[PDB]
Design a protein around this ligand. Structure first.
Ligand SMILES: *[C@@H]1O[C@H](CO)[C@@H](O[C@@H]2O[C@H](CO)[C@@H](O[C@@H]3O[C@H](CO)[C@@H](O)[C@H](O)[C@@H]3O)[C@H](O)[C@H]2NC(C)=O)[C@H](O)[C@H]1NC(C)=O
Ligand SMILES: *[C@@H]1O[C@H](CO[C@@H]2O[C@@H](C)[C@@H](O)[C@@H](O)[C@@H]2O)[C@@H](O[C@@H]2O[C@H](CO)[C@@H](O)[C@H](O)[C@H]2NC(C)=O)[C@H](O)[C@H]1NC(C)=O
Ligand SMILES: *[C@@H]1O[C@H](CO)[C@@H](O[C@@H]2O[C@H](CO)[C@@H](O)[C@H](O)[C@H]2NC(C)=O)[C@H](O)[C@H]1NC(C)=O
Ligand SMILES: *[C@@H]1O[C@H](CO[C@@H]2O[C@@H](C)[C@@H](O)[C@@H](O)[C@@H]2O)[C@@H](O)[C@H](O)[C@H]1NC(C)=O
Ligand code: 56I
Ligand code: NAG
Ligand code: CL
Ligand code: CL
Ligand code: CL
Ligand code: CL
Ligand code: CL
Ligand code: CL
Ligand code: CL
Ligand code: CL
Ligand code: CL
Length: 847
C-alpha cells in the first residue's frame, strides 16, 4: 500500500510539519525523500468520497458523494452533490457542492459528438475526461483523495504532459515548472519577484498534449488557493473556501482553448485607438508647468505621444477626486490644452478614501459614509487602514450603492478636469499596515486551518481584515475580486461620464478582467532580468484574455541605463499597452533625456509602432469579436512544432509578425526560433542582413546592433500600415500602405478593421469598414466585407510586395500603368505607388 513511485506521491501533511508517528496516525505513508517531494503521502487506500446514485439528465449527470472517514481538517462536508453538464461540443462543466447549504460562489454572467468523453470512478471517487479523437486522458481526479471541508477544498488530476501555462500572476517562464512547485493565488502588492503571489489571480491552465493538441481547465473559485504541480505529472487545486466549479475546454488547438475559455469569462474589451499610442508617466511630475514641458520636450524631439499621465502629484494631500492649488492650480486648463493638441490625459486613482478630514470637508468620504459604500468591520463601522492620504476607508465594489457613488465621484471630478480614462492602482486592496488601524479579530477567517503560501504567512499581510464585511460576502471570499470589481465600477463610471469607450488600466486582476480593462505588470526593476521576464508575462496575460497589457518601459524601480532603455523601448514598442513610467526617486527616462544615437533608436521604435497601429487595432478587433490573442507565443501559432513549446523570449503579433528582441547587455546579435516557412525582414518595407529567412524550423542567429530590433513578416500575410504622426489624431488622417508577403506560390491574405476609434456599440450598429486583401497570380485585390462612412475615404497610396523573384516589365493599377514603382533585385522587393481607396474594389497587377 506504501509502494507509490516518488513523483506520484500526494502530500498527506500539506498543513504542518509532521512526524512519522503522526503521519501513520493519519492513515498515511512515511518515506523520506532521498535528497519538494512529500515525506508523508496518501496510500491508494486513503479514504476519499464514494460515488452513489449516479443519474442521467438531459444536461448530463448528477450524483451524491459520501465521505465516511473524516480527514485531518475540521468541518468535512460528508455529503456532497456532483452535477456534470455537457454544455457544448468543446466545453464540459462540473460542480461539487454542499446540497444542505448554499456556499459562496463567484458572481459570473451566463460526426455530431462532443470532443470529450466522461467516466467516473466509484470508490475512490474521480472524474475521468478523455479526448474522444485519440483516447488521451486529460483529467483524472482519482489520482488523489477529494477533500471538501468548510475552509479546505482539494481536487487533483494527472496532467497529459510536463507542459502547462497559466495560473497568473507570478514572475515565471510561460511554461510552469512541474518540479514540486507551489503557486499561490492571493492578490498582493509586492514588486514582481519569483515564487511570490503578485497582484492578480487567474485560476486557469492550458495543458499541451503530445502532437500539438491542448485543453484548458478553469476553477471558478476566488478564495486564497495553492496550486501544486508535481513531476508525475499532476496538479492539485487547494482552495480555502467556496465550491468546486470546474470547466474543461477541449480545443483541440491552443488558440481554440483560449477562445473557449473567453466564451465563459468574456471576450476582451475593444480599446479606443488612442489607447494603442505611446503613454508617458512618472511619479514626480510635480506641477502642470513640468507636465506641459514633457509634452513640449517629446514634440521638439519628434517623439510620438498620444497620452500624458500624472501620478499622485496632481492630488490635494494624496486624495482622490482633488487637485492641489499649488503646482496643479490650472489642472483643468492643462488637460483642455492637451485635447486641443490632439492628445488624451490619464491619471492615477486609488481605491482608499481619506477618512480623517473634518466632517463636511471631503465629499468622497462624506457621501460614501452617507450611502454606506465602505467595507465594514465587526461593529458595522468602516474598516480603517493606512495608505497615501493617511487613515482611509475602502469602497465595497460589490455594493450596488457603491457603484452609484463611484459613478457620481468620477462624473463630478470629470466636470472639473476632463480626463480620458482611469489608472486604478493599489486595488489588491493594498494596505500599508496589517488588516486595520484596530487590528483584526481572532476568528476562523483571520486564522484559517490552511494558509496558502502567501508572502508574510497571513491573509492580512499588506491588505485588510479577511473577516471584514462586503455586500455579497466576507473579504475572505471576495479579496481576489477586489481589483476586478473596481475595474467594472470604473468601466461603467467612464461610459456614463464620457459616453465613449472606457480606458481602464488596473494593477490587480482576476479571471475575466480583460472584458473591462487592461493591466500593467507593476513595480518591475530597471534590470535586464525584468526586461527579459516581461515577454513571458505579456504572453501569459494574452492567453488569459487581457491582451491590453505591458510593463513600464525602461522599468519602474531603480535607475535605467541608456542601453537598457534602448532595448526596453524596442521590445516595449511591441507591448499591446505601451507606457514608459518611472518611480519618484529614479533618474529621468523620457526618450528625449538620452544621447542622440539612443534618441534615434527610440524614435525608430515609436515610428514603427505608429505605422503598425491599423494592424494592431485590427488584432484588438479579432480579440474583441473572436477571443483571439494580440501578442501570442510561437506555440499558439505552431503547436505541432514541439520546438516552439519552451519559446518565451520571442513573440508574435497575431499570426504574421515575429519579434526577436535583444534582452541582454552588450549583445549585437540574437538567436531566435523560426518556424517552418519564409520570414521576410520588415527592414525591407519602406516606412516614414538577409532579406528573407528560409526556415525548415530552426534556430537562426540574427545581426542585432543597438539601433535594431529584429521583426520578420510571415510569408502569406498582408499587413495594413498608416503614415506618421506625433498622435493618432494626426496619424489616422494619413494615407495607408500594404506590406504583401508572398508565399513561394505567390499567395497572401490580410485584413483591415476601421471605425471612428472611440464610439460605443460600433459592431452592434454596423458603424465600421472591414476589408480583406488577397494576393494571387501577380495580382492584389480588396474584398469589401463592410463599407460605411467610417473608412470609405481611406487612401491607399503605396503597395510593397515581398518575395517578387523577377523584375516586372509593367505594373498596373486598375488596368493603367502606375505613375511610379521600384524593384530591388538584391531584396526581391517591389514597391508600387498607387492612388486607391480602401473602400472601393481595386486590382493591382505586375508581370
Ligand atoms: C471598527 O472600525 C471603527 C472605525 O470606523 C473602530 O473605531 C475606532 O475604535 C477605537 C477604539 O477601539 C478608537 O480609538 C480610541 O480613540 C480615542 C480618541 O480618539 C482614544 O481616547 C482611545 O484611547 C482610543 O484610541 C478609534 O478612535 C476609532 N476610530 C475612529 C475612526 O473612530 C472600531 O474599533 C472598529 N471595531 C473593531 C472591533 O475593530
Ligand atoms: C440513493 O438513493 C436511494 C433511493 O432514493 C429514492 O429514489 C430516488 C430516485 C429519489 O426519488 C429519492 O427521493 C428516493 O428516496 C436512497 O435510499 C432510500 O433512502 C430513503 C431515506 O433514507 C429510504 O426511506 C428509502 O427506503 C431508501 N430506498 C431504497 C430503495 O433503498 C439512498 O439513501 C440514496 N443514497 C444516498 C447516499 O443518498
Ligand atoms: C485514473 O487514475 C487512477 C488512480 O491512479 C488509475 O487507477 C489505478 O490504476 C492502477 C494502474 O493501472 C491500478 O493498479 C489501480 O488499481 C488503480 N487505482 C484505482 C483507485 O482504481 C486509473 O487507471 C486512471 N484512469 C485512467 C483512464 O487513466
Ligand atoms: C538612482 O540614482 C540616484 C542619483 O544618483 C546620482 O546622480 C546621477 C546623475 C549619477 O551621476 C549617480 O552616479 C549619482 O550618484 C541615487 O540617489 C539612487 O540611489 C539611485 N538608485 C539606485 C537604486 O541605485
Ligand atoms: C502604485 C503603482 O504600482 C506605481 O506605478 C505608482 O507609481 C505608485 C504611486 O502611485 C504606486 N505604488 S504603491 O503606492 O507603492 O502601491
Ligand atoms: C525639457 O527640456 C528642457 C530643455 O532641455 C529641460 O531644461 C527641462 O528640464 C525638460 N523638462 C522635462 C520635464 O523633461
Ligand atoms: Cl498506513
Ligand atoms: Cl493531525
Ligand atoms: Cl517545462
Ligand atoms: Cl457637487
Ligand atoms: Cl446579498
Ligand atoms: Cl457567503
Ligand atoms: Cl530545438
Ligand atoms: Cl537554442
Ligand atoms: Cl479610386
Amino acid at each position: 500500500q506504501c509502494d507509490v513511485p516518488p513523483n506520484s506521491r500526494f502530500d498527506c501533511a500539506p498543513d504542518k510539519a509532521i512526524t512519522q508517528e503522526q503521519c501513520e496516525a493519519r492513515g498515511c505513508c512515511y518515506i523520506p525523500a532521498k535528497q519538494g517531494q512529500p515525506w508523508c503521502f496518501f496510500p491508494p487506500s486513503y479514504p476519499s468520497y464514494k460515488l452513489e446514485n449516479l443519474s442521467s439528465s438531459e444536461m448530463g449527470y448528477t450524483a451524491t458523494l459520501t465521505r465516511t472517514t473524516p480527514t485531518f481538517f475540521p468541518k468535512d462536508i460528508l455529503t456532497l452533490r456532483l452535477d456534470v453538464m455537457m454544455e457544448t461540443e468543446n466545453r464540459l462543466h462540473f460542480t461539487i457542492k454542499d446540497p444542505a447549504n448554499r456556499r459562496y460562489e463567484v458572481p459570473l454572467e451566463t460526426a455530431p459528438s462532443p470532443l470529450y468523453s466522461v467516466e467516473f470512478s466509484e470508490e475512490p471517487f474521480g472524474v475521468i475526461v478523455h479526448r474522444q479523437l485519440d483516447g488521451r486522458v486529460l483529467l483524472n481526479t482519482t489520482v488523489a483523495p477529494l477533500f471538501f471541508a468548510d475552509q479546505f477544498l482539494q481536487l487533483s488530476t494527472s496532467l497529459p504532459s510536463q507542459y502547462i501555462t497559466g495560473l497568473a500572476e507570478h514572475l515565471s517562464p510561460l511554461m510552469l515548472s512541474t518540479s514540486w512547485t507551489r503557486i499561490t493565488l492571493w492578490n498582493r502588492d509586492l514588486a514582481p519577484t519569483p515564487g511570490a503571489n503578485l497582484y492578480g489571480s487567474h485560476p486557469f491552465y492550458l495543458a499541451l498534449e503530445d502532437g500539438g493538441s491542448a485543453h484548458g481547465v478553469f476553477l471558478l473559485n476566488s478564495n486564497a488557493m495553492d496550486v501544486v504541480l508535481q513531476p508525475s505529472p499532476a496538479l492539485s487545486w487547494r482552495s480555502t473556501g467556496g465550491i468546486l466549479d470546474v470547466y474543461i475546454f477541449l480545443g483541440p488547438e491552443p488558440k481554440s482553448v483560449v477562445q473557449q475559455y473567453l466564451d465563459v469569462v468574456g471576450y476582451p474589451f475593444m480599446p479606443p485607438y488612442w489607447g494603442l499610442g505611446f503613454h508617458l508617466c512618472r511619479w514626480g511630475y510635480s506641477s502642470t508647468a513640468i507636465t506641459r514641458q514633457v509634452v513640449e520636450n517629446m514634440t521638439r524631439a519628434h517623439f510620438p505621444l498620444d497620452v500624458q499621465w500624472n501620478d499622485l502629484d496632481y492630488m490635494d494631500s494624496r486624495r482622490d477626486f482633488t487637485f492641489n492649488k499649488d503646482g496643479f492650480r490650472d489642472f483643468p486648463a492643462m488637460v483642455q490644452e492637451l485635447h486641443q493638441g490632439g492628445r488624451r490625459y490619464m491619471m492615477i486613482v486609488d481605491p482608499a478614501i481619506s477618512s480623517s478630514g473634518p466632517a463636511g470637508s471631503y465629499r468622497p468620504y462624506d457621501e460614501g459614509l452617507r450611502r454606506g459604500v465602505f467595507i465594514t468591520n465587526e461593529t458595522g463601522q468602516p474598516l480603517i487602514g493606512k495608505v497615501w492620504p493617511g487613515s482611509t476607508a475602502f469602497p465595497d465594489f460589490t455594493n450596488p450603492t457603491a457603484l452609484a457613488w463611484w459613478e457620481d465621484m468620477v462624473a463630478e471630478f470629470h466636470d472639473q478636469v476632463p480626463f480620458d480614462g482611469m489608472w486604478i492602482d493599489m486595488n489588491e486592496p493594498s494596505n500599508f499596515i496589517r488588516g486595520s488601524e484596530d487590528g483584526c479579530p481572532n476568528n476562523e477567517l483571520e486564522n484559517p486551518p490552511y494558509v496558502p503560501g502567501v508572502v508574510g504567512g497571513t491573509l492580512q499581510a499588506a491588505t485588510i481584515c479577511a473577516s471584514s464585511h462586503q455586500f455579497l460576502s466576507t473579504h475572505y471570499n471576495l479579496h481576489n475580486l477586489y481589483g476586478l470589481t473596481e475595474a467594472i465600477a470604473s468601466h461603467r463610471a467612464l461610459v456614463k461620464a464620457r459616453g465613449t469607450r472606457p480606458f481602464v488600466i488596473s494593477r490587480s486582476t482576476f479571471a475575466g478582467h480583460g472584458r473591462y480593462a487592461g493591466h500593467w505588470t507593476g513595480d518591475v526593476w530597471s534590470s535586464w532580468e525584468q526586461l527579459a521576464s516581461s515577454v513571458p508575462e505579456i504572453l501569459q496575460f494574452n492567453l488569459l484574455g487581457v491582451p491590453l497589457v505591458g510593463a513600464d518601459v525602461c522599468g519602474f524601480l531603480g535607475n535605467t541605463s541608456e542601453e537598457l532603455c534602448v532595448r526596453w523601448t524596442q521590445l516595449g514598442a511591441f507591448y499591446p499597452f505601451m507606457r514608459n513610467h518611472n518611480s519618484l526617486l529614479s533618474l529621468p527616462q523620457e526618450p528625449y533625456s538620452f544621447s542622440e544615437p539612443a534618441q534615434q533608436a527610440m524614435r525608430k521604435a515609436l515610428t514603427l509602432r505608429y505605422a503598425l497601429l491599423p494592424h494592431l487595432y485590427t488584432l484588438f478587433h479579432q480579440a474583441h469579436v473572436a477571443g483571439e490573442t494580440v501578442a501570442r507565443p510561437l506555440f499558439l501559432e505552431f503547436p505541432k512544432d514541439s520546438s516552439t513549446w519552451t519559446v518565451d523570449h520571442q513573440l508574435l503579433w497575431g499570426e504574421a509578425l515575429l519579434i526577436t528582441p535583444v534582452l541582454q547587455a552588450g549583445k549585437a546579435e540574437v538567436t531566435g526560433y523560426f518556424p517552418l516557412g519564409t520570414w521576410y525582414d520588415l527592414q525591407t518595407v519602406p516606412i516614414e542582413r538577409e532579406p528573407a529567412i528560409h526556415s525548415e524550423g530552426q534556430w537562426v542567429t540574427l545581426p542585432a546592433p543597438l539601433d535594431t530590433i529584429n521583426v520578420h513578416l510571415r510569408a502569406g500575410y498582408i499587413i495594413p500600415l498608416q503614415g506618421p504622426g506625433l498622435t493618432t489624431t494626426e496619424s489616422r488622417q494619413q494615407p495607408m500602405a500594404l506590406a504583401v508577403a508572398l508565399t513561394k506560390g505567390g499567395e497572401a491574405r490580410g485584413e483591415l478593421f476601421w471605425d471612428d476609434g472611440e464610439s460605443l456599440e460600433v459592431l452592434e450598429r454596423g458603424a465600421y469598414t472591414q476589408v480583406i486583401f488577397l494576393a494571387r497570380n501577380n495580382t492584389i485585390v480588396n474584398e469589401l466585407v463592410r463599407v460605411t462612412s467610417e473608412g470609405a475615404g481611406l487612401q491607399l497610396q503605396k503597395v510593397t510586395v515581398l518575395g517578387v523573384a523577377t523584375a516586372p516589365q509593367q505594373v498596373l493599377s486598375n488596368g493603367v500603368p502606375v505613375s511610379n514603382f521600384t524593384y530591388s533585385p538584391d531584396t526581391k522587393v517591389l514597391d508600387i505607388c498607387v492612388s486607391l481607396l480602401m473602400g472601393e474594389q481595386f486590382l493591382v497587377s505586375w508581370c
